[PDB]
Amino acid sequence: RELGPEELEELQAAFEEFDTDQDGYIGYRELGDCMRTLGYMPTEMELLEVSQHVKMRMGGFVDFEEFVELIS
Ligand SMILES: [Ca+2]
């Protein structure tokens, strides 16, 4: 329980950098580049399923509360 504010706030700081337009929404691929910022690089299949999460080829949208719920 002690760990949270640091990580939570840390994740938010990343979103700010990822969201240049601060539209509160980001693509789907940028999510992978976010996990790396955690010091640990992603595998390949884990991010693969995410790309399909778009359900469509078009560019999907993900909010801060939608991205976090995914990264868990
Ligand atoms: Ca954005």
Swiss-Prot record:
Phosphorylated. Phosphorylation levels change with the light conditions and regulate the activity, but has no effect on calcium binding. It is found in: Cytoplasm; Presynapse. Expressed in retina and in the inner hair cells (IHC) of the cochlea. Ca(2+) 1 binds at D19, D21, D23, Y25, E30. Residues 6-41, 60-72 form the EF-hand domain. Transmembrane segments: none annotated. Involved in normal synaptic function through regulation of Ca(2+) influx and neurotransmitter release in photoreceptor synaptic terminals and in auditory transmission. Modulator of CACNA1D and CACNA1F, suppressing the calcium-dependent inactivation and shifting the activation range to more hyperpolarized voltages. Interacts with CACNA1F and CACNA1D (via IQ domain) in a calcium independent manner. Interacts (via N-terminus) with UNC119. This is Calcium-binding protein 4. It comes from Mus musculus (Mouse). The gene is Cabp4.
